[PDB]
Design a protein around this nucleic acid. Structure first.
Ligand SMILES: [Zn+2]
Lengths: 232, 86
RNA sequence: GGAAGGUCUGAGUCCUGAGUGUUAGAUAAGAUAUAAGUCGUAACAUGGCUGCUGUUGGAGAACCAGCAGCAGGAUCAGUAU
RNA sequence: UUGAUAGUACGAGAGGAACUCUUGAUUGCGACCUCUGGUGGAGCGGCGUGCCUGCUGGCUGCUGCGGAGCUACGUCGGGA
RNA sequence: ACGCUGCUUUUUGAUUCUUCGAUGUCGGCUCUUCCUAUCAUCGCGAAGCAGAGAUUGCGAAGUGUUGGAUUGUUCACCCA
RNA sequence: GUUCCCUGUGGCAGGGGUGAAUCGACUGUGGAUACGGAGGUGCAUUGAUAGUUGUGUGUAUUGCGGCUGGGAGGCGACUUGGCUGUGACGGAUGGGGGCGGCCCUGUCCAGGAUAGCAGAACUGGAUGUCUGCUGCGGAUUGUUAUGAUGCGAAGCAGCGAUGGGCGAGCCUGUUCCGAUGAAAAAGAGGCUGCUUUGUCGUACCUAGACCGCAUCUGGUGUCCACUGUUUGCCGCGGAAGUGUUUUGUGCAAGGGCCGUAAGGGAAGUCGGCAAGAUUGAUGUGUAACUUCGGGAGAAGGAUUGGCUCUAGCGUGCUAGAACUGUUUGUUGUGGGGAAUCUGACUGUUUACUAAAAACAUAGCUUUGUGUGUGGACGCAAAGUGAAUUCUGCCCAGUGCACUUUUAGUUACGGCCUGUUGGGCUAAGCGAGUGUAAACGGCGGGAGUAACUAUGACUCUCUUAAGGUAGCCAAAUGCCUCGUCAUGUAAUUAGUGACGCGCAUGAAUGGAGCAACGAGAUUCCCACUGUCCCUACGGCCUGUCUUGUGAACCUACAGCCAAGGGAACGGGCUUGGGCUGAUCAGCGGGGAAAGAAGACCCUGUUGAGCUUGACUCUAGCAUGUGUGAAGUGCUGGGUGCCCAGUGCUUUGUGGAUGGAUGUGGG
RNA sequence: GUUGAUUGAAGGGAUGCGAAAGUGUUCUGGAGGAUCUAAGCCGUUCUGACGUGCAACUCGAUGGCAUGACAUGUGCAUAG
């Protein structure tokens, strides 16, 4: 055989990468006052980015829905509750939506940083200083009560409300983001390139669930380690 | 004008009728004009996804992809605003 | 009108387009009167799971099940420290 | 193949021929251009586009008729 | 009828003698020539041949044997 | 890479020619002769060079001097020797205004042709304002279009900026994107005088000066280029500039590219292949169906020149009338209609025999993953292929997942016990449960309704479950040219209907055709040399002359009948024969030429690809040896060895030896 | 780098109907992987020419596409 498409698309990307800018906020224990100086678009992202200026430091963060240029926000551990306002996660009531939550007290942000997402604060277990939160995927996770966050949802709304509708729109999206476009189906190739192969009719020819444990790398194509298949 | 098709009349008869109704709904709120809150004039338009700007006084704010506010943004903007009063 | 011709009225021929009737057709869904029947028993008694109206799924067939409503019901009604 | 032979011979009837004479054709073969048809970058006319300053006269494009010659859809020709 | 004896080389088999340092492999269209086991035209017998229409046999290969619908078809099957 | 100029000569030989502050590069950026960037324009000059030589005027720069100022004005916008700005950024489209060129027009000075006539022609040259901002003012105002305005309209006064008609840069708006349109070098500045400006390239050729073996009908980045007709920078014709010869014939048959045809009108053919036919503009008139947008330029009918006038306002377009000809006017520009199969649509493909029903696509569904610079509206792997309407039943086999906290099976090393055995300590396999938009699968036999016929109903064998909704002799039906109807004079074709369907059937996707198609099929109108059946004509070839002058192929050769022969002889045996040596034709034979048959078989000859072939292997999983010191804690058996295990700082995280399992990558 | 035309979506103006809710007509504007044509680019058919060729893939007529999921010079990255 020859080497399959999955493995070559991985090698092309170490030669010529897609790069995003790494948003994060700094450490400031005393309550300061910031200044949104600009909100801007970025290639390969869907969310707009805000430029906020402190007394001796500037930062780039995901803008929340409800920000505007020239607005003042506060940073510090004991800061008041309002859209924006980087503050510590024990000063936040239950049922409130936050974004860009860190996990180690000083790493910037880790959770909920894409277009239109947030995490939920569910419980404050005041003994042991633990906070249960819900992250965007649904998993529940206890963090310390000293990690910081941002109040509100990320801007950029529901981007899937509008269909792509046309070939050229999927062409411009994959140029900016790096998806495989177009995709030739594996059953339409010759056997030399794909485990799905030739044959006098187009058909896979054997089970499409494959293992995730113990088999050769380059055999893991299809539905890898699937617990269940079917419509519902 | 057109009876049922509106701003989706640029598509002729392509793509199917269910998909042309999704285009018509999101295209009306995306290309409309909104009143500014700082100056009070009707001059807000969309620049890119999530960026709405006023042509007079130049102020920029952040919202939804195709609408100026989103249904889950309104819900949490109130909670922060009731929490401060009470 | 000197004539070649011009003008008005206009049948008929040749072609296209609506209408309003009437009719043939392989196949094929109903209705009704019969015979002589075959399979069951849905309704009428609390008719052996009370019955009926709308709606949505299912079964050889009557019909069966879910959600709300009606008595044309099997109740004009029953002891508060 | 037409007319005559003949509604005759033959036959209860119904039906129904031949030798000899006579009229036209179909197809093959070999010629011919008087007539009719086709063609005719020979010739004459009509209507145009550009160019010679315009009219006259030219050159260039499309069109009607179209002699001679060639031809067929036209004309001629079979042992006792 | 039941049995028995032949001929042709147009069918399809049987065989493997020639050709694998290559003999262009189906049908149609076009064009020529040969055979007779004669379909028509010419001559002549038989009859369960009255006439008419056909049926069966002998001499005879000079001349003729068409136009279409459906199928790639050979073949087949209908119309004139 | 000297091909450029001059001289001599029958192509060579000899001697000449390329001049730079103000052209390009040597300098910027992870890149560069097209991106960024200190600096110019006229006129004249050689045999051959010129933004380079000479000259009129300007701009920058190297260095060296001399003199001189740190404030005046304006309510304000701003004026002045009086710093900290730029470089620096996409597509489409409207309005205003135009470099050069071209056209119409008044006047003046000249040019070329002419038999005759021409209100005096034709040609050349020269001349012929508001995007914005401030003060007062105090409510209206404007566009082709969207508008502007008590967050201060119009108006008045200022500041700043800058002959007529057909538009390039330029000014000013609107719009489009899950696409929003590089980076770095390079800032300072007044009036004057002298002085400086390094290195390398520069001749000639856009195809007869390049590549394709060549003076080859092929290929090769960018810029400029007039006019009549016209919507048209196309087609059909003209300028400017550029290229070009002067003693071959005159035209048989057969070819290559074209023109015209009586009467018939697809009878031709596998098949309307080829040709003919429609064609611009403006009134009129437009169906079924349909995703309501379309279908649609549907279909069908009519008008059109020249001349002389009228009407409108926006002055070149639009509308109306009379007259006239040998009846005729677009001297260009889509054939249409009725059905079936198939792919939704615009797109892409086998450079050199396949353009498609193949591939892509939006939409729809499933799977994995809490972190990569990227943080689940994310990133990656598969199938189906727009919308609409649907997507049934089967977990027994194979695959995948979880669990083994209630069987078995199983390796190094360590520990235990014993005379060289036995115990204890893994994952995997096995077992249990779940999963079909995973791979796939989806039955026989007997009776039974008052004529026959059939079987709602019953018994029976049997499966993991027995093919559901729909659809069909369909690109899927062997038998088969199935059976009935319809179109023809005549139907192995087409369409409609029927269904025990060799072997239809549900994201292996089923049913379904609005819109789109150089896709596959059948019929109708129109039209014709496709044919009946061919004729005549044009130009280039061929035929004939002069010059230049190949190749393939060749045992030896070259008339027939029969015979025998390795079973189809030019030559052998027995018979029959044209014609003494030319020229043009032609396709019967030479089992004609080309190519050590690709089909087929054999060889103990290969290679591409697959897997349930044999033997192995990268990677991955899981125990275990090596590695760093000190301490506490809970549990096992007999004092014991081990498990997890927290803590302390003072090793470190980079690795490395062997064992078992898995492994068409 | 990319000519000249055709069709006429949203938004905006005017005018008519109606008790109201609502709706008719017509201008303006200039959307869309919307329809032709040019510079040009491809390669459907003639199974046309040619087939020791102009040519180791060309020539003629006919046809398809021409604002893009385009075409093209040059710096860099990918190698059996
Ligand atoms: Zn504003």
């Amino acid at each position: 055989g020859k080497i399959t498409r999955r493995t070559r698309e991985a090698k092309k990307k170490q030669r010529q990468p897609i790069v995003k800018v790494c948003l994060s906020y700094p450490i400031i224990p005393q309550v300061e006052e910031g200044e949104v100086i600009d909100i801007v678009h970025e290639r390969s992202r869907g969310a707009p980015v805000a430029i906020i200026s402190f007394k001796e430091d500037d930062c780039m963060v995901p803008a929340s829905e409800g920000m505007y240029t020239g607005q003042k926000i506060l940073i510090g551990d004991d800061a008041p509750i309002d859209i924006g306002n980087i503050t510590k996660i024990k000063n936040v009531p239950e049922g409130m939506a936050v974004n860009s939550v860190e996990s180690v007290y000083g790493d910037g942000g880790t959770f909920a940083m894409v277009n239109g997402s947030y995490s939920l604060v569910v419980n404050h277990r005041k003994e042991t200083n633990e906070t249960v939160i819900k992250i965007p995927s649904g998993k529940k996770l206890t963090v310390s009560s000293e990690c910081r966050c941002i109040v509100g949802v990320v801007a950029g709304g529901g981007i899937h409300d509008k269909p792509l509708l046309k070939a050229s729109v999927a062409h411009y999206k994959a140029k900016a983001r790096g998806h495989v476009f177009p995709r030739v189906r594996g059953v339409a190739m010759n056997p030399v390139e794909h485990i799905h192969g030739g044959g006098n009719h187009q058909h896979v020819g054997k089970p499409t669930t494959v293992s995730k444990k113990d088999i050769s790398q380059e055999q893991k194509i299809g539905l890898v380690g699937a617990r269940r298949t079917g419509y519902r | 004008g057109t009876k049922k098709v509106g701003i989706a009349g640029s598509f002729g008869a392509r793509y199917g009728s269910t998909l042309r109704k999704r285009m018509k709904a999101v295209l009306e709120t995306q290309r409309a004009k909104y009143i500014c809150e700082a100056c009070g004039k009707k001059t807000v338009k969309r620049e890119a996804v999530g960026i709405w700007k006023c042509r007079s006084c130049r102020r920029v704010f952040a919202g939804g992809s195709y609408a100026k506010t989103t249904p889950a943004g309104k819900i949490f903007i109130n909670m922060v605003k009731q929490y401060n009063t009470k």
